[PDB]
């Protein structure tokens, strides 16, 4: 028994397997900010901060000089959701037509908050995202979406002049991604030209993101520090429904602010 | 001797081989609904129902509570056709110019009914097809057929937002398939762009289908349960003609209604 | 953890053993309908129907003829009962004078409903019992109970003329069984003569049965299909009492209606 009291939940092993599979597949599908940043191996619930490597202003009394280290604490996110004991029982009887809508909604909320923190910043967790921690002026996007290659080339040139290099990934909102995909120019999709301009990179479909942005993928520019990873725990239950939650402890840090540029 | 009294039919072995080859080739060519759904190994004529895994409302008398399981019975389809003893005799004499038109017509009818049940639903067999068992609103198709990529992208985005994923297959009626194939845009066929948008999927020529629709191919979203497969049996004969039939027992079930979207 | 959340119940292992032993012994003692019918190995909770092997009337549209298979769904029975935490705790302390009256009552109710379904029919589960699915006219029983051998011989002759054969078992209600046992004729118990007339069969004490009936034991005349067998599950608990239940999923089918005759 860890802090996730899964053994106390009135849920069968098959139902647990189905719920975990649904949650992990939805998270893998929906999470797009984890592909543009470096995600090391999770440490554990014990870890609580990441040291920035800097020190504050040092006070001087007598011969003694004292300076304080600078750290960024982690934050944990818990999203609770309620599932149906009827579906849990149907799992063992053989139901395969069960749609875990509360689980999908909880995973969607978790991905939304994590991607917002990664790409823009939270300001509640002390996290500054790629867009906010950017020294480059935003690149204007031309209209009609056929000339988006101009903005892509401008962003690539800005990153190249900033000595950033590496293949660039273009993260787009879901609506803009669909519009770019359906744009065909002179019968030649603009996605191919964008991929050519991205120097071996790719265009990323990020429904959670509300801003388009280009990030270099050379490595070491940003990092998502994870303690406890995405896990499902048990809270309480009734005669009809069972309350579970998704828990994840993390923080995000941008080392080089010049490796990302926001197109707007 | 099974229920198919083939040994009683006045048909030579070579004629049986020719008829079976014609029937199986026509079925493989004409059946398009079997490629978008999961078809497990046939069980046999003994199987008669598939359990849905759910139970009905439970009546409560005294301490006894009784609840009834929910099942879907299978249905068998028999299509009879009449062949010519003159052609049957010519088979052994060496005729290779024999067109088994009644066999082709029977296979066409069987494919029509099976594909209609799979893709739209029968309502006589208790079968709900992919189109009817769909929670997504139908996607409007633009005119002139050059902008069909817009509808394809919209369907793909709807499925992606529904966390469905997997390569998508676009089933089209035969006339619409020919029109899409002959559409060339700026000298660049739209089929290539459709294949790119389908995420490794394919466009399927379905003459039996009367509605266009996109289905995910990840697996486990729909299933065609088969008892007896497509087989040819003997009914009666005259001095001139022999009456045979095509028999197939099946049912169809959609587990996840959100894996398919109908373009109309 | 299966659907029986036994691990969540605040019940010790010794108390579980005592409750299970009491339930199984009471069921073995009290269930008499299971001895006259064929009981195969239980399949499991996944099974939900039994195919009758027949098909309904076939509709004919164009060349297509469609016919629907006939099946009988299973039904599950749940009987809840409340036990005492004081007795549960006394079990480990060493109490051996504990009478599990709620468990006995629940087992009695389960046996009553199962035996009624087997021998007479439920009409709620779609089950037709041996008495109802009988083509033989009921055999009149003479008074004073010394001449019950006449009715037994008449039933045996009816079954023999129906080409049924096999040793016959005479199921009686509990009161009639006691009266027959205490009847002594000319100082010679009628039970011996009944056993001689039953052709190697036996007289069965069935308190749940409310009608006397003779059933052949040759095999293959009736069948009790079982999914989940008799098992004990956990529902809820309080500071004083624990609520459990007995669950059993089954159906019953008579293949040959002429192997049983009801004496009334």
TrEMBL record, chains A, B, C:
Q: Name one Pfam family in it.
A: Linocin_M18
State a GO cellular component annotated for this protein: encapsulin nanocompartment
Tell me the domain of life: Bacteria
Q: What is its main location?
A: other
Q: Which InterPro entries match?
A: ENCAP, Encapsulin_nc
Keywords of the record, alphabetical order, are: Encapsulin nanocompartment
Q: Where in the cell is it found?
A: Encapsulin nanocompartment
What family does the Swiss-Prot or TrEMBL record give for this protein? Belongs to the encapsulin family. Family 1 subfamily.
Identify this protein by name. Type 1 encapsulin shell protein
